[PDB]
Amino acid sequence: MKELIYIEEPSILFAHGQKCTDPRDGLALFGPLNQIYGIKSGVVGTQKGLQIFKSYLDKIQKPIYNHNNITRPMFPGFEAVFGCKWESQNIVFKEITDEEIRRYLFNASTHKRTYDLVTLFNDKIITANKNDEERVDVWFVIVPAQFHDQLKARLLEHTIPTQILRESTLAWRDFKNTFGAPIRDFSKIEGHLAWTISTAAYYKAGGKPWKLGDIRPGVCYLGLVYKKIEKSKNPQNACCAAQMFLDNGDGTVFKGEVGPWYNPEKGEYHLKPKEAKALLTQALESYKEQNKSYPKEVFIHARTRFNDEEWNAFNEVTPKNTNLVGVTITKSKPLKLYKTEGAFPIMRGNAYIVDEKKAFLWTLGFVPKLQSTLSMEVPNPIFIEINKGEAEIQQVLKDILALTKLNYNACIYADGEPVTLRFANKIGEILTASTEIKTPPLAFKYYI
């Protein structure tokens, strides 16, 4: 019988310094922030893949609409939303061998066949980069098994952007099953898939669609994720870390402090002191050099709870007064509510408080402007708590709700969890394919 607390929905920035709520709504309204026109593209693969990719590229030029448009807005032409020239008449194409030098059946060794295929693709791409004369930005690899991890890891050392597309994506019309019916039906999301592909291509080309300008100056945010690596001793180290929003000349810095600080244990997860201070110093020095000053507040995200001696080590790191506050987030607590009447769920934005520390937040539900729900069944909320430090309880709630929009890999209205942990997790698996790299690149476009 306790009342709930609603929190407003922060807005994003767009061209000419305006604001909106749905990113694609603003895109159709104004468009991007910065200007990018270099989309000279190259494609490698077989004849069928090249032909279908060219057909798709000439198809995307005209506007298209989905089955229902009250939820998903209209998709105009690509020149009519961003402003560029994307065409199939300026593509550099190369042909993979038509015959197979790797046996068709995965009988000898599936790992060996995957390594051979990635070796062939990597060598062809490197020869193309180091031999030819043209200038290219992206590469749209068609595929006729944990493959792309190795390819991204092996292409990391050459600093070339890339993207992967599967053959089953485009030819769903004639890709019938064994009974003659199509396996996949994309007669409902074609506009949104076009939106996502265009946004991903524009980001990879070197252009940011939207930024943020309603954040408190002088504060910086951090996140940590943990993953297991299993070679001989199964030593779980991870510590891939994430990005940070250090203030600058009216921008949104998103570089991430990377480098898997080794933690040599099999069951211990939290942290070790020397790696802790190394990580914190590496995170802090970038702010120190960029802002030529010192931060006033440090915020730490965590996906799991952490020990105490790490905080003992971190206490001396605080230069003068910049106290660091560390919080934890989970993803599963059974509190499935039900609306008293009708057949409709609850809406996102409501928060629940049990004390000064714990809190339940609902980032899944419905939004009236979409008229529908983000989830299929009744949504379930998430839990937040300030593990270490003292801060206002609604501050972290509104902050964690604020960071649920910077999802550059898609264009959904909102996402389940904040992206600070999401991007760290995303880079985690692809960095661990081969850890023989020293000082990896810090930009967030090479890693997807």
Partner 1 sequence: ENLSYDDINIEIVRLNAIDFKKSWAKGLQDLLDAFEKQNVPKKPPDHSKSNLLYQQIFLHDKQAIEKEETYDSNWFPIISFPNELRFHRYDWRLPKQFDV
Partner DNA sequence: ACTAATAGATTAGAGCCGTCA
Contact status: 335 vs partner 1 (CB under 8 A): yes
Give the three-class secondary structure for 264. coil
User: With CB cut-offs between 5 and 8 Å by kind, which of Mg ion, RNA, partner 1, none does residue 29 bind?
Assistant: partner 1
C-alpha dihedral sign at 155, 161, 164, 165:
negative
Q: Residue 311 corresponds to which tokens in the numbers above?
A: 């905080």
Query: Tell me, what DSSP letter sits at residue 299?
Result: E
Q: Which residues carry a binding-site annotation for Mg(2+)?
A: 409, 448
Six-digit token string for 118: 């990635």
Evaluated on CA atoms 200, 206, 210, 212, the torsion sign reads: positive
Report if residue 448 touches Mg ion, rule: CB under 5 A.
yes
Report the length, in residues, of the chain. Answer: 448
| 67: contact with partner 1 by CB under 8 A | no
* Residue span binding DNA (CB under 7 A) among the ranges 15-23, 109-117, 159-167, 299-307: 299-307
Considering the rule CB under 5 A, would residue 359 count as an interface residue with Mg ion?
no
Residue 448 contacts which entry, Mg ion, DNA, partner 1, none (Cβ below 5-8 A, type-dependent): Mg ion
Question: Quick one: what does residue 373 bind among Mg ion, partner 1, DNA, none, with the CB cut-off 5 to 8 Å set by partner type?
Answer: DNA
Binds 28: which of Mg ion, DNA, partner 1, none (CB < 5-8 Å by kind): partner 1
Spell out, one character per residue from 132 to 171, where the chain touches RNA: x when CB under 7 A holds, - when not.
Answer: ----------------x--------------xxxx--x--
Nearest residue relative to Mg ion (C-beta): 409
- Taking CB under 7 A as the rule, does residue 366 contact RNA? no
Between strands 163-164 and 138-141, the pairing is parallel
197 touching partner 1, by CB under 8 A: no
Residue 376 binding: pick among DNA, partner 1, Mg ion, none (C-beta 5-8 Å cut-off by kind): DNA
Task: Say how far apart CA 433 and CA 149 lie, in whole Å.
Answer: 6
Asked if 303 contacts 239 with a C-beta cutoff of 8 angstroms, the reply is no
Nearer to DNA, 45 or 379 (CB): 379
Under the phi-then-psi rule, with left for phi > 0, alpha for psi from -120 to 50, and beta for the rest, what region is 74?
Answer: beta
- The CA distance from 299 to 322, in Å, is 10
How many residues bind to RNA according to rule CB under 7 A?
32
Q: Which two tokens stand for residue 243?
A: 């990005």
Q: Which residue has the tokens 């994003």?
A: 12
Q: In what order do the strands lie in the sheet with 324-329?
A: 5-6, 350-353, 359-361, 382-388, 324-329, 297-301, 219-223
Q: Are 348 and 362 spatial neighbours (Cβ–Cβ below 8 Å)?
A: yes
Q: Which of 407, 420, 425, 432 binds RNA (CB under 7 A)?
A: 407
Q: How far is the CB of 185 from DNA (least distance, A)?
A: 8
Nearest distance, CB of residue 158 and RNA, angstroms: 17
Of residues 73 through 132, those in contact with DNA by CB under 7 A are: none
- Residues 415, 418, 420, 421, CA torsion sign: negative
- Using CA atoms, how far apart are residues 24 and 27, in angstroms rounded to an integer? 5
Contact footprint for partner 1 (CB under 8 A): 16, 18-21, 25, 28-29, 65, 69-70, 73-74, 334-341, 346, 367-369
Contact footprint for DNA (CB under 7 A): 67-68, 71-72, 188-189, 226-228, 269, 303-305, 330, 343, 372-373, 376, 429
Contact footprint for RNA (CB under 7 A): 148, 163-166, 169, 186, 189, 192-193, 196-197, 200, 266-268, 336, 364, 374-377, 379-380, 407, 409-410, 412, 415-417, 448
